[PDB]
Amino acid sequence: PKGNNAIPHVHQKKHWNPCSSQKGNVKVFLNQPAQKHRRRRLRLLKAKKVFPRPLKALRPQVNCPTVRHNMKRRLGRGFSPAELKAAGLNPQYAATIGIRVDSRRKNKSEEGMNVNVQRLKTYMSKLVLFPMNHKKVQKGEASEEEVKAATQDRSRFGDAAVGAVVYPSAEAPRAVSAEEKSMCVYAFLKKNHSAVRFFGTRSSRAARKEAAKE
Amino acid sequence: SAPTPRTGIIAGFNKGHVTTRRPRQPSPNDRFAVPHKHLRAVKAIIADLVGLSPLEKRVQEFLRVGKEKRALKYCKKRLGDFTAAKKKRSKMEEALRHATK
Amino acid sequence: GAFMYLNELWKKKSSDVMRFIQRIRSWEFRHQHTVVRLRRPTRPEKARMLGYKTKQGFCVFRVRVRRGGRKRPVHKGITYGKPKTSGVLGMKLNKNNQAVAEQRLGKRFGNLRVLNSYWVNMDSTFKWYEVIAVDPMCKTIRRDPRINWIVNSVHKHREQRGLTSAGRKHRGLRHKGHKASKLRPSYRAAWRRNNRIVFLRKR
Amino acid sequence: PTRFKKCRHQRGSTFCGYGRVGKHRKHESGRGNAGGMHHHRINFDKYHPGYFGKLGMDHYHRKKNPMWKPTINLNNLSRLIAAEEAAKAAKGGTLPVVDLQSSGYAKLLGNGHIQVPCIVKARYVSKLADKKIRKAGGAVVLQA
Amino acid sequence: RLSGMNHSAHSWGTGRAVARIPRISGGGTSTSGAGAFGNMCRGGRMFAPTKIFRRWHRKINLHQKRFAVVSALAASSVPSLVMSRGHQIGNVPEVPLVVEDSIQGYEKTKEAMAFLKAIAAIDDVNRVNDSREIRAGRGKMRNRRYVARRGPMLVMPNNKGTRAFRNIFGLDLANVSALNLLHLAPGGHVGRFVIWTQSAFEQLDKIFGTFTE
RNA sequence: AGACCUGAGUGUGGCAGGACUACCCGCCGAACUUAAGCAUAUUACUCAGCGGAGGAAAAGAAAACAACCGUGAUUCUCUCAGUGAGCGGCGAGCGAAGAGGGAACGAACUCGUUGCCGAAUCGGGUCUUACAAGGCCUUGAGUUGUGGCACAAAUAUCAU
RNA sequence: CCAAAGAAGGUGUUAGCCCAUUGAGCCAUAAACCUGAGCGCCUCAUGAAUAAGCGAGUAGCACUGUUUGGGAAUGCAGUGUCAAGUUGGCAGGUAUUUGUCUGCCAAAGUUAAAUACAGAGUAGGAAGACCGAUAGCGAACAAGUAGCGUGAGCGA
Ligand SMILES: [K+]
Ligand SMILES: [K+]
Ligand SMILES: [Mg+2]
Ligand SMILES: [Mg+2]
Ligand SMILES: [Mg+2]
Ligand SMILES: [Mg+2]
Ligand SMILES: [Mg+2]
Ligand SMILES: [Mg+2]
Ligand SMILES: [Mg+2]
Ligand SMILES: [Mg+2]
Ligand SMILES: [Mg+2]
Ligand SMILES: [Mg+2]
Ligand SMILES: [Mg+2]
Ligand SMILES: [Mg+2]
Ligand SMILES: [Mg+2]
Ligand SMILES: [Mg+2]
Ligand SMILES: [Mg+2]
Ligand SMILES: [Mg+2]
Ligand SMILES: [Mg+2]
Ligand SMILES: [Mg+2]
Ligand SMILES: [Mg+2]
């Protein structure tokens, strides 16, 4: 008999199984360890080719969009030209010294821009710029001593010079203020929520009242 | 103008975490709303050279006999959009007013 | 410049003068071949926008395609199976006529590379498209950085794979985001993504 | 493993536990959920009431992220307070601050008795949770 | 996927006094009219042909894996459990056997072999040497021709100093930072004979922790 | 006379056709089967058919997401999710997207248009050790427009 | 007795020391590839110290057909009809008409990597809790061979 079971919805009604008459539609992961070894081998090979430049270019810090993730921070695509301008860098030049540039990203707040400007300033302080001609060094270029002392970043996210993404500091313990002991927080929040929730029907009542006025 | 700051709570008219908001930055796409004097002049010269389309002649005659509502319905069927229909009617009203003198 | 007057003149296709010009040209094109080589494009402003240049190695052809819906090529209009697949006259080709015109030209002249094409004229029974083609063996083409890419063999018969602008149009590639999720990078590619059964090693 | 299945025990039993009369045929009831209203109605009606029909309004393009709103009760608040701060917390003194949205919560609900007074930062709070935490020496601060 | 099914092979029907099984088409061949496609037919397809998306690998809880290594290590310090696993540890001075760090300076197998005799680990090595033989069965046709016993496991603090020990047949080398349960409990049986280097032994409390730390 | 527009003949220098086709791109496209019948549905935007490439292909630099403290070309992976989305004789069944953790990433460029110039352009001879990204010559092509400069990663450029 | 070599093949029985293997290292090289964008010469290029526009039988819309989870219509096709650019246009997943907001700027093109190789090839390699001559590819062998069919094909 059937009995008490979940009603099954396992799909699998297409020609997914490889057999005679069917090529199948499947994807196994038997090459996962070999590809993982290959990726690490390629990364170590690439670091040798680009030595002493960092393997990963510098990336900004951005806030994750959604209200579910807006408390989180992560690396962004590239630094905005407004951020690069505030750090005194031409964006086209910045792309030649391992800085990603993103001209789509806007800066809607000062806090988000300032933290990314700080990252660029820290990067420029630690930057060792090799000269085009070691016998004729121009300004802003490293001497022979620092050139021979150069080391490679090799970080997974390329953030040895600037550190990890910065999170806001946790609030320290304190005492309960006098207003907090008596203020009904639920009433304050509900009133604000109802103002938006019934904004349309409150104005219509008010607008219709003015029609009755005249 | 400076954007209105947020109140720091999850609900309300200016809800949201408080930051120091920055004003909208100028963009190269802002000139799309700038009047195009030269493009308008080129269209005027071309329009005078070629005359009126079959739709344009039909709409103009509607406005001559005073059937302004019927002109809008005729434009809407041909153009498929109400915003486009009004502009076509408005252009033909100006053309009718221009031909008076 | 002079382009603006040319461009705005071609937007008044229903005016008295433009219908007269197209009526004469449509009559002349009716009495020509299905594929005709031109010395110069009929719409130089339109051809240049699509990549044509007045240089050695650029060729323009006018191609004619017959209008109307596709008739299913079943014998005596008899289909089999479920009645859902019983239509003969009411189905439409999933490829536009501009893409058909490009494919006819590229298939006929295999020594050229189809770049782009544009609408020139219509008629009750015929549609005319002018196709821009490039000779890959020309020295002018082979040394021009703006057109050099077409020499590479990966662009051989790109119109047969739907890679031209008209091909991209009927593939749904004019759209992005939520309007094109199931057809990007292609319908088959998305189907493979959504229908292959995945067996992780440790599951 | 194959050596533990019923097949090994049924070697030599011929019918393999399916009977001589009814036998083991291909699909004697139909395939899958066939006949949910015909000849399988009793099984559907007594084990899955409500399966057939329609109900409620439609919501095209549902996004779960704007609807994110995990809740935590007042009597579970010690899960988010470090052990050393909980001991030092008492009504009238210095209390730890709990950031709910950084711990994965959006609303303070307020079931049960609170175990350690504290200042809770939350996006939402129930009317009972706000009343109980204030009577116990704590407070609720709204965040976004 | 195509094996045993590379034929036309239609059934003949009931009118002809033969079994209703698909039969190879054509003529002029000893295979024409022969049974086909069946798991019971010669040259046919096997029942339930094997597939590559079988579950070859397994997930194990991370805590359960560390529990097993911990239990295998505790068993290695019980001399009766080591003897019960088959190791000849009747002459070694102490269990767990901890030796000085200087073995990592050895360069010649002669020096390493002399050290194994001093701490009386050579008896378990000799047990492995005498057990070497051709594997019984089909596995010798594959690349599994020779079999032998396990022998002592020498644990070093790092990946250095193994140069003189690599060629010693019957001695396995381990890193204290990566201890493998498969080697600590061969065949699933606890009680492996482990020779600890002093530096590796002193790292055990940090690596595996304590009941309170 | 001649021109230039259109269209031919021949000489000279080249290219296409066929093979392969596992994967990939474009079209065309069933039925068995499932629904315990069957027609919508399903199998399946699959098989068969016709075309076209490459070591990959396709996609790709926002007429994109979102509705946030905001993200930022494309592709792929886990997850979102067999889904309190949705589609469906609302039956059988079917069924994604944003966000998040990652792989990769020196990732960006060109034309048309608009302004300012205007044959500075391209082929073909010939010379330099050179079918030079060079010089000189060339009506041959091109003013029915080839190239140059500047267009938000920008704020002169052009002679010295 | 050797072992920085115990490595699994061969040799008339089961081989570290009978043979071959197993390592530092040595020698030779079209071009290409990598190396203060390796380093000279000639030649040729080259960097630094004021307004206007922006892709038209296109986008839309109607009918039909198809496809999609996309539902008063997700993409597309045929025909008809066909714009805007004087805060314009497109998107914002329930149709309409308004007015506010947000993002972006279609109708021209090139582009490496991460991905596929579900009955492909070239040059090499590493393997297997697999099969073991009625098994495993049809084919361990002068196998797509002998043989059969007018043929497409079939096929030991
Ligand atoms: K069923
Ligand atoms: K389908
Ligand atoms: Mg019973
Ligand atoms: Mg019963
Ligand atoms: Mg049960
Ligand atoms: Mg078959
Ligand atoms: Mg240099
Ligand atoms: Mg049919
Ligand atoms: Mg995707
Ligand atoms: Mg997936
Ligand atoms: Mg699936
Ligand atoms: Mg019996
Ligand atoms: Mg019995
Ligand atoms: Mg039974
Ligand atoms: Mg039964
Ligand atoms: Mg019975
Ligand atoms: Mg009934
Ligand atoms: Mg209802
Ligand atoms: Mg077989
Ligand atoms: Mg023996
Ligand atoms: Mg045996």
Ligand SMILES: [Mg+2]
């Ligand atoms: Mg070795």
Ligand SMILES: [Mg+2]
């Ligand atoms: Mg089937």
Ligand SMILES: [Mg+2]
């Ligand atoms: Mg049926």
Ligand SMILES: [Mg+2]
């Ligand atoms: Mg049946």
Ligand SMILES: [Mg+2]
């Ligand atoms: Mg039937």
Ligand SMILES: [Mg+2]
């Ligand atoms: Mg096929």
Ligand SMILES: [Mg+2]
């Ligand atoms: Mg690749």
Ligand SMILES: [Mg+2]
């Ligand atoms: Mg490509």
Ligand SMILES: [Mg+2]
């Ligand atoms: Mg993106």
Ligand SMILES: [Mg+2]
């Ligand atoms: Mg779930």
Ligand SMILES: [Mg+2]
């Ligand atoms: Mg489907």
Ligand SMILES: [Mg+2]
């Ligand atoms: Mg991501």
Ligand SMILES: [Mg+2]
């Ligand atoms: Mg992702």
Ligand SMILES: [Mg+2]
């Ligand atoms: Mg020259």
Ligand SMILES: [Mg+2]
């Ligand atoms: Mg130009």
Ligand SMILES: [Mg+2]
């Ligand atoms: Mg041997």
